[PDB]
């Protein structure tokens, strides 16, 4: 036998950090949830049991914590560059760090109609992620992301025009509910390393702002004709807002909704115009994916 | 051996319901999840194999689906007394509806600084519950709820002059983070029977928004001397608020932010007042719990 | 306002204890999760920010591992009878301690059909459960349970003759799938104190596995009526088989296996006699409750 | 902008199936979670809102009933291949399918010593799982695991002469506990087809047992040296075992069970060779993985 591919690490290191103004009082608050695995000339600690090449887990850990002491945490692309160039700069037998950060909302109260200065809330389990993966002659690949995102719209869905053989029972419909939890991804154009990472930090919060507000737009005021059609259309817009990304990736849950007929019921009428009231249905699911990329 | 007490019905039964504004195209949707659990001359169904006493749990979601076609599904105490009511009027035998409703949040999006009229967002897993008890001759019992209602405040809490004896060693804080979930109960006053709830429909919603308000502020506000005081605060507040409640139930963890020594490393000072970087803890945590009445 | 009921301590405290035969070289584990949630006199925390009422949160998670280093962690009864025990003695001003213990599997491996002295298997989730209430002069309350039994029959279970009016859709059957998630709890006579606990110390262990043999023979023997018969049958015989039970309680969620009917599809036959394919739905779902007790 | 990739289909179609045996009586019972995504010139139903290349996702959902309903669904990789082929020879647009299969748990009841003839028991959260990719003009790629096994020994493991330096904190051990949840695949030599598929029907079942009883048998008898070391064990002997085989991944977590120091207290020994309580870690823990194949 041989090792063909071989990464270790941390993960789930949670890690809080505040900053505080000295000047003003305001506090602000991040969080994440942070995984590191590296790849080197490791192979022997799995077939030799030389622990020598291992750089221990807990001392990746350790690592975590003094890189965000040291160094902005915020935006996670560039404290995810940071981290993993530590590791390939650091140990000269590690060559690929790839390291997964999740970001959890704490959003800014506002009390009586002002900010607090401290004080903060979980407005939603919707993350904020990157991976960043750092390999040693090959620069820094970033993929960004935001995922569960969860919406419904009660109109302005439509599925009709599919493919109907023997094996279709599904109603064609010009009105339905349409509700997903959204996974959307920007891959960059690679990186050469840190500094260019640098030279971009204030894209990576101005495009997760586009690609969020492009998603929440279209998926409100696209009258959809299928997931397909209103998720490329996302990812059209993305594309065309930021030229250092080369793909958009969706993927896309049809959490369905179901009408629900009463009239066994004393004749009521709750189906087609008359849908009032609906059974959401935790599964099956519908899930639809695709990767955009530049004609 | 002999039946002491039994209950039995429907759980988990999700439901969606819009409503349509015609005029205005504004649409509005509401989702819950409901278990309606009933009790009454039911025992032979244990030990004698009489399902004539049994109304099929299948039925008592029928039921759940046409009461919230027929029916106001907002504000859910009123649904839930309702739906109650349906169960002990309608079955002689049936003398106790146990109603649970968890309301999901579907929050208008703002689509270009104007609310859509058809598309909505779940702006957290915080939720809004109810209980209510309805009871043959004995009216109608509901306590209401929040949930899920995650915060951290970044200083401003304190932990000091605490009990200290040979189990003890936590030092003393005059600094700490101060993270929880809140679950905040209100319990009403009795009412003799639907009429009643309807009286006071509007004080439901606007007590849960004084509940809300009132534990946003609080939590924001007080320099916190232990979870103890805060939540007392809180629950005073609520009961001088609103008279035709007679209890306030708070039940609070406290998710606990870790200071890193990091001093081993190059003297890095990360503690105290140069605390910036912090661990969150999945597990222990404390729990802290109170009922407030009034004096 | 003024405080009526509070109770604070520590949740989540995981704990793990070994127990090492130097003889043989047979190691045996115990893994837990604990909560500790105290009362007494100590109301002044809450209204006055009076700390010194305090046994610190932090402490009575000290005190739990304590515990377990100088104590035996089985069988859990015990263990929770002597830590709750612990609070009340050593704390003038505490009055009651509820100790909850949810125990884990870890069932010794069979290598090469021989016990491993070392090497231990989780299998399953199904938790064995106390909750144990110390009440200063009121001695000690405990509750004894199984959770997170999953089982299925794939026919001798029953459902018909059940009540029938305008709100029912459901047809009867004389045969379909049965399948639950057991929770069952027995309720032991109230212990004096820590001694008449330790008098019945076998009996612990030898209820707990005849509450679990006559669940699993009575799910799987019973040609059953229905959920609520079945579950009778399970209480009466544990009821009979312990003396210093006073009641049993069943909670049995109804987990649906819906049949499909493909007969739209080339005349497939898959419902009654046919019925091979089936859909199990995550929700909603029956759930049936009973607390049996002597006549 | 252009469609760079693109796959949809219906995720998480729970499925049972049951065999009965009309001579012995004896009933066996099958439950699974099913993914079937589709690929293929189905570009235009995102770019173009043309629908008429969508094979509905539910009629994917109904594909896998009737699929179910005529053939066997064990072992899942000949049902995942006859799943998949299915759907490429069936539609002359799709030139791809790939089918995830989860397999739960359930094992006949052993009553009063006696294998039960329809009673089944959950015995614990393992799966079994297949990952199917059916490619038109690529035969198929199978990929199956065992996953959610979760397991603890004791003593024999070690860690020791890792690579320490400035970031280093942990202390070499000769003693520790080590526990793991077992993600293991084995992923196949392609096959040409559903024939070659059939051929080899016998060697899927054989090959899950052969690698669940060498990780549990490694992992119980190797004193190990880290978990890089014992995983690679694995995976040699599953290679040596089936040459169909072409390689074997394992990812495993090191779930940490923390020493506890207690000699603050009353000087309680319980460290080293003292060690009996340990706090099991929820987050954060290490991540080991490695893929081996041929030399
Ligand atoms: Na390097
Ligand atoms: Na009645
Ligand atoms: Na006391
Ligand atoms: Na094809």
């Not at 009709?160 to 891959?187: M, P």
């Amino acid at each position: 036998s041989a090792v063909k591919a071989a990464r270790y690490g941390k993960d789930n290191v949670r890690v809080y950090k505040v900053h505080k103004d000295e000047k003003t009082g305001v506090q602000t608050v991040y969080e994440m949830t942070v995984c590191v695995l590296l790849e080197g000339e490791i192979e022997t600690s799995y077939t030799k049991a030389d622990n020598s090449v291992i750089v221990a887990t807990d001392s990746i850990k350790n690592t975590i914590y003094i890189t965000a002491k040291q160094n902005p945490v915020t935006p996670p692309e560039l404290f995810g560059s940071i981290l993993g160039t530590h590791f390939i700069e650091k140990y000269n037998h590690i060559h690929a760090a790839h390291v997964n950060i999740v970001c959890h909302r704490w959003t800014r109260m506002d009390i009586d109609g002002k900010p607090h200065p401290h004080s903060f809330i979980r407005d939603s389990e919707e993350k904020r992620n990157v991976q960043v993966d750092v390999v040693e002659g090959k620069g820094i690949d970033i993929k960004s992301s935001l995922s569960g995102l969860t919406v419904l719209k009660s109109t302005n869905s439509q599925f009709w025009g599919f493919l109907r053989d023997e094996y279709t029972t599904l109603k064609e419909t010009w009105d339905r509910i349409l509700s997903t939890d959204v996974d959307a991804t920007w891959q960059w154009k690679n990186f050469s390393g840190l500094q260019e990472v640098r030279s971009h930090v204030p894209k990576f919060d101005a495009t997760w702002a586009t690609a969020r507000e492009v998603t929440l737009k279209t998926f409100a005021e696209d009258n959809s004709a299928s997931v397909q059609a209103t998720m490329y259309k996302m990812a059209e817009q993305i594309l065309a807002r930021q030229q250092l990304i080369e793909t958009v990736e969706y993927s896309l849950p049809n959490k369905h909704y179901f009408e629900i007929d009463l009239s066994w019921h004393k004749g009521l009428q709750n189906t087609g115009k008359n849908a009032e009231v609906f059974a959401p249905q935790s599964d099956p699911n519908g899930l639809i994916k695709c990767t955009v990329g530049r004609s």
